[PDB]
Structure 1
Amino acid sequence: MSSLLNSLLPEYFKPKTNLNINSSRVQYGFNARIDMQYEDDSGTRKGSRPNAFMSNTVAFIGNYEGIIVDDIPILDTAYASELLYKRNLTSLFYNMLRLYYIKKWGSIKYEKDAIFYDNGHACLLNRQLFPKSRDASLESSLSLPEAEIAMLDGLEFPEEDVPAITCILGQACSEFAPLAPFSIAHYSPQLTRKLFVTDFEAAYLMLAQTLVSPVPRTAEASAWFINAGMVNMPTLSCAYPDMLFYHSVAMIESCYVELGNVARVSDSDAINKYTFTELSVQGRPVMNRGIIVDLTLVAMRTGREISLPYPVSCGLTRTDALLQGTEIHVPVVVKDIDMPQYYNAIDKDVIEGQETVIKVKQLPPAMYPIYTYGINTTEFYSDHFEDQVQVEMAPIDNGKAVFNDARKFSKFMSIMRMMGNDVTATDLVTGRKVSNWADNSSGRFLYTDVKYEGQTAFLVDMDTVKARDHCWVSIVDPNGTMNLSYKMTNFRAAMFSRNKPLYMTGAERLRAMDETLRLKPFKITEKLDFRVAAYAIP
């Protein structure tokens, strides 16, 4: 559905036809201009950040598995009556589209002993997260066999379990058995053995989910991509190409941003992680799985009613790591000796080179809003164009300021980050050090960087406030009530690949509203807690 996914892109950005991708990693963002204005009891200070780059990172690596399931027929004598109620060519077009992009971008290298995430304290290699893998190019990954394409001559009885519609059709129907973990070369079962000689729209949306996978914002956000997500491919029965990259990035961003909020919803409300899809959908699908889950999250993001002609339930299901009451064991590598102080590690004493495991209870946000920046602003992300943040500074006793409240602590470290001051605080309950400079790519502070669900009080170190990036606005000693008023203008999209700039080249409405799928949006209603999110009907 082109017109749907085309709407998600920002109004200022209009991409060109061709895009020569020559790597397994692409940064995308914008170069904005920030005009900050500071006021406190000491006096006033005015500055301006001339060029600030806010970006996510997306890759072509994601462990997926295919299952053949029975879905609804797309309707767009004895034998005909049995066959017409199972007609679906979506699975055939899906494989034909994957073969197109394997040949086009068939020079992408996957190295086994490469980095996946790297902050400075911890590190994840591609040996971990993807065992049973070797070093191979994308063209060298698959060695597809060929199914028998026979000619249908007068034959009176249709042979059962064979559809009726050379090298491309032969390989499209065959089994996919990859060596390197690639997004568009994932394991798929055999469609058919023989093949005698709106369905495309389903396959187009189904590939937009799979094509690219997010590189995690922090080390804790690797918990999403441990367990292999299942791709529901329908059973095969019948009786501007490069623009897909931008539509795919737009879709997976919208899903992984909104799951950041759904994860924080308490399991004692009307709309919760279990019963959010069922309340949203207003059709009759086979099961609330695949695309229905993803398009529900896009509706919640944009805040508009999305509509498909047929209630199709085919594609990747992401909400698997979310729907289980168990802490997830992310395997990590120790780079600095002081790692156990920051991350919730099993072994409290470690050495540089040791392979340990960290515990993740609540799933943090995997991506920050970039394309969907300021279309609807929540208090959690605080992705405003114009905003006036007001916070009251705690009394500095010796060289330490106690922040008992949770909301005030979030606003304080959010200001000091925009000014460009690397502040480090100690959580009193756990006894672990939090830092506002957690993510370098996106220049903002989320409350999930604390890495402790529940209630606590923070002891901020005001003496050891380092000066990483200093504009004229930037001050070290706050006094009384802190007011910061910033304005964002002059947005321009920029893409980076392999640490260099990647440039773009080239009569009556018979309603019939009974069978059609409709997805209703939910609006976030902020409340006093700030740690908990809550949904309501608009």
Structure 2
Amino acid sequence: MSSLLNSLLPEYFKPKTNLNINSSRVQYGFNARIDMQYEDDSGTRKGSRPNAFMSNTVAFIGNYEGIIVDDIPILDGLRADIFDTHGDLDMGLVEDALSKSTMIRRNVPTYTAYASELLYKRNLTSLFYNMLRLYYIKKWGSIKYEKDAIFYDNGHACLLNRQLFPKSRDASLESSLSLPEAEIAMLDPGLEFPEEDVPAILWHGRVSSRATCILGQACSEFAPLAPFSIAHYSPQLTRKLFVNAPAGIEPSSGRYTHEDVKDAITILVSANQAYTDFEAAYLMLAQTLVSPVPRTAEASAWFINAGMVNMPTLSCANGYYPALTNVNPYHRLDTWKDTLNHWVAYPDMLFYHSVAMIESCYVELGNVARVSDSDAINKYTFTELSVQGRPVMNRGIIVDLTLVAMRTGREISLPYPVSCGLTRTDALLQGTEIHVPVVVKDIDMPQYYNAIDKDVIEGQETVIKVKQLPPAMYPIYTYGINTTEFYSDHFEDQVQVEMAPIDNGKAVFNDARKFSKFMSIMRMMGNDVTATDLVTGRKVSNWADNSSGRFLYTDVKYEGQTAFLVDMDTVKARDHCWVSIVDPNGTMNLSYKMTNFRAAMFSRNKPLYMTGGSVRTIATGNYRDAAERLRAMDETLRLKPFKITEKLDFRVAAYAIP
């Protein structure tokens, strides 16, 4: 659904068509003007950062594994005559429709008997999904993956690509897959009895030399070398695929460009009348196009074990019954062609729709992981109460759409209760300790991180014990639309730390809430604060991120009693464009204000600019008003004359309109 994913984008964000991606890492964000203030009994110290960049790093790598599951049939496409008043295939009108058609008379009785089983095999989501992946593999084919590269680095702990993804050879995305071609046979119209467990599709005119090569590779096993997101492992959809094309199927060309895959999709959707099938495939790919680079070192627990992708079995019986598909189809919603029409016009817009969906999910799974099991709406039972339909199993797209509904605070409506795609809530529901590997840089690591060893020499491979999952992404596109006090993503905020002159700089935060806001605002001001817990004896640093520049309470890496000693004569100025706290006395009052917002994207430590035309909000009415218009100007070549007009020179001629 293009419509619901479009509304997630911010108001200030004005996207263009083309986006020239030339790397496997993008820092999307915005530039804002922060007017910071520090008030005290001595006086006020004002600062101003005119261009403050708040970013979330997003990569094109992520371990996924496809499995073939059984899903509901999508009945949108078949002629409206055979359907009854309630909206199910009234068998008896099917036998009537087949009888009054251009079918062979000896096949009518035997084909009608099979109809009861074969007409309820309508799900082309798996085919469209694979064909969409082939489009983006050939478009962004020049992106590279190095084996000994930095997945994450925060100064203390480092995590390499070798650690998370073993059995991984370095190669380009184009050179990753070597897809073998499945057989594309021609359906004989005079076949005695239809062959079930072999799908048959429709086609307009002649199957081109390149269309054979695309359909051949789409219905085949994906066995990748490099762990890419749009080239993950998928099982063999089918062995053989029939195509009811009276004009013969040309043999396989071997080569094809990304423009030829768009040609193949547009013919397949139009012939089969499968637009709702495409809408399902569009939302599936939106989840599993890009995966987020973790915000903290201990936020890598989400991507340790491979999340399963639920691909519904390829099943289509249109080739055997050409009569039942015509120009008057049955559809539930009137805006059922909107998702395809959006993709054909603006293919590269999927990148923005993808980051919008994963940012919405991973933000909400952040503040869902911090609720006790003894509650009404908890970790296990947040999907059941929200869903008001009848899906087969609460997995895939249902779990991701219900998290988006919680974030935006609106009602998401789909025409069919389809349960296909990636399932994210895997590591959460387990409710056990996860052992993430790490290579150390400094020697004073295991004070900060909950490490397995207490003394570790530099360059050693250690393990961190993560119990509660910290947030993987900070809200950026969904900044101050549905604000919570955990993230504290306000435009205006203030904190009041109360100290007396008798205290020699040392302040104890009994409250946990205002400790989080103090440590966060001090980092905007470019000050390196290092607090020490009095009960346990561990240490926390506000500088625990190089992207967002905020301090969340989950950076403590421990749930206990709150007694944080902060010594305010060991505060060090780290960044540029900073206010100085030289020597405070009395009550401190910190405050900031974010005024304006400008969309910015970075890649390879350089600005990535959006190019091409101005993207519009395509509606169903905007095309069918031109159908209402029809260009009703009678196609008659009316040539109008020009009267020559003489003036002073007479050498040169001058023509007038009348």
TM-score (norm 2): 0.75
Cα offsets for 1:412-446 (capped at 9, x unmatched): 21232232211001123332220011112112111
Q: Distance in 2 between matches of 1:31 and 1:534?
A: 57
How big is the shift at 1:266?
Answer: 1.0
Q: Distance in 2 between matches of 1:427 and 1:530?
A: 99
Q: Distance in 2 between matches of 1:288 and 1:533?
A: 79
1:316/1:510 CA distance change after superposition, 3 Å: farther
1:473/1:519 CA distance change after superposition, 3 Å: farther
Q: Distance in 1 between matches of 2:215 and 2:286?
A: 22
Q: Distance in 1 between matches of 2:181 and 2:65?
A: 21
Q: Distance in 2 between matches of 1:416 and 1:532?
A: 79
- The answer to whether the 8 A contact 2:500-2:587 is kept is no
Residue range with higher mean Cα deviation, 70-79 or 87-96: 70-79
Cα offsets for 1:228-275 (capped at 9, x unmatched): 000000011019111100100110000001111000011110000100
Report whether the alignment pairs 1:230 with 2:308. yes
How big is the shift at 1:214?
Answer: 0.3
Report whether the alignment pairs 1:188 with 2:238. no
1:518/1:386 CA distance change after superposition, 3 Å: farther
- The answer to whether the 8 A contact 1:123-1:332 is kept is yes
- The answer to whether the 8 A contact 1:146-1:171 is kept is yes
Report whether the alignment pairs 1:515 with 2:635. yes
1:475/1:387 CA distance change after superposition, 3 Å: same
Cα offsets for 1:430-484 (capped at 9, x unmatched): 3222001111211211111111123231121222100123657543444444333
1:168/1:396 CA distance change after superposition, 3 Å: farther
Q: Distance in 2 between matches of 1:253 and 1:100?
A: 24
- The answer to whether the 8 A contact 1:208-1:251 is kept is yes
Report whether the alignment pairs 1:448 with 2:483. no
Cα offsets for 1:103-154 (capped at 9, x unmatched): 1111111111000001111100000010111111111111111111000011
Counterpart position of 2:290: 212
Q: Distance in 2 between matches of 1:324 and 1:534?
A: 86
How big is the shift at 1:69?
Answer: 0.3
Residue range with higher mean Cα deviation, 478-487 or 442-451: 478-487
- The answer to whether the 8 A contact 2:68-2:313 is kept is yes
Q: Distance in 2 between matches of 1:181 and 1:400?
A: 50
Residue range with higher mean Cα deviation, 371-380 or 456-465: 456-465
1:81/1:443 CA distance change after superposition, 3 Å: same
How big is the shift at 1:45?
Answer: 2.9
1:530/1:232 CA distance change after superposition, 3 Å: farther
1:337/1:524 CA distance change after superposition, 3 Å: farther
How big is the shift at 1:507?
Answer: 36
Gaps in structure 2 of 5+ consecutive residues: 77-111, 202-211, 243-275, 317-344, 615-628
How big is the shift at 1:384?
Answer: 1.0
- The answer to whether the 8 A contact 1:387-1:487 is kept is yes
Identity %: 100
1:157/1:49 CA distance change after superposition, 3 Å: same
- The answer to whether the 8 A contact 1:299-1:520 is kept is no
1:327/1:519 CA distance change after superposition, 3 Å: farther
1:296/1:56 CA distance change after superposition, 3 Å: same
- The answer to whether the 8 A contact 2:495-2:514 is kept is no
- The answer to whether the 8 A contact 1:413-1:423 is kept is yes
- The answer to whether the 8 A contact 2:124-2:277 is kept is yes
- The answer to whether the 8 A contact 2:118-2:196 is kept is no
TM-score (norm 1): 0.91
SS, match of residue 340 in structure 1: coil
Counterpart position of 1:171: 217
1:491/1:537 CA distance change after superposition, 3 Å: farther
How big is the shift at 1:394?
Answer: 7.5
How big is the shift at 1:13?
Answer: 0.6
SS, match of residue 503 in structure 2: coil
Gaps in structure 1 of 5+ consecutive residues: none
Counterpart position of 1:336: 442
- The answer to whether the 8 A contact 2:72-2:418 is kept is yes
1:530/1:492 CA distance change after superposition, 3 Å: farther
Report whether the alignment pairs 1:44 with 2:44. yes
- The answer to whether the 8 A contact 1:281-1:517 is kept is no
Residue range with higher mean Cα deviation, 83-92 or 141-150: 83-92
SS, match of residue 517 in structure 1: coil
Q: Distance in 2 between matches of 1:385 and 1:88?
A: 47
- The answer to whether the 8 A contact 1:399-1:463 is kept is yes
How big is the shift at 1:520?
Answer: 63
- The answer to whether the 8 A contact 1:404-1:456 is kept is yes
1:530/1:138 CA distance change after superposition, 3 Å: farther
1:294/1:213 CA distance change after superposition, 3 Å: same
1:221/1:426 CA distance change after superposition, 3 Å: same
- The answer to whether the 8 A contact 1:282-1:519 is kept is no
How big is the shift at 1:501?
Answer: 1.1
How big is the shift at 1:47?
Answer: 2.5
The root-mean-square deviation of aligned C-alpha atoms, in Å, is 15.6
1:522/1:406 CA distance change after superposition, 3 Å: farther
Residue range with higher mean Cα deviation, 505-514 or 102-111: 505-514
SS, match of residue 67 in structure 1: strand
How big is the shift at 1:535?
Answer: 77
- The answer to whether the 8 A contact 2:149-2:161 is kept is yes
Q: Distance in 2 between matches of 1:534 and 1:347?
A: 94
1:136/1:471 CA distance change after superposition, 3 Å: closer
SS, match of residue 554 in structure 2: helix
- The answer to whether the 8 A contact 1:308-1:516 is kept is no
- The answer to whether the 8 A contact 2:526-2:579 is kept is no
- For the pair shown, which has the larger CA radius of gyration, 1 or 2? 2
Cα offsets for 1:61-93 (capped at 9, x unmatched): 100000000001111132122122231000000
Residue range with higher mean Cα deviation, 211-220 or 75-84: 75-84
SS, match of residue 507 in structure 1: strand
1:66/1:4 CA distance change after superposition, 3 Å: same
- The answer to whether the 8 A contact 2:222-2:232 is kept is yes
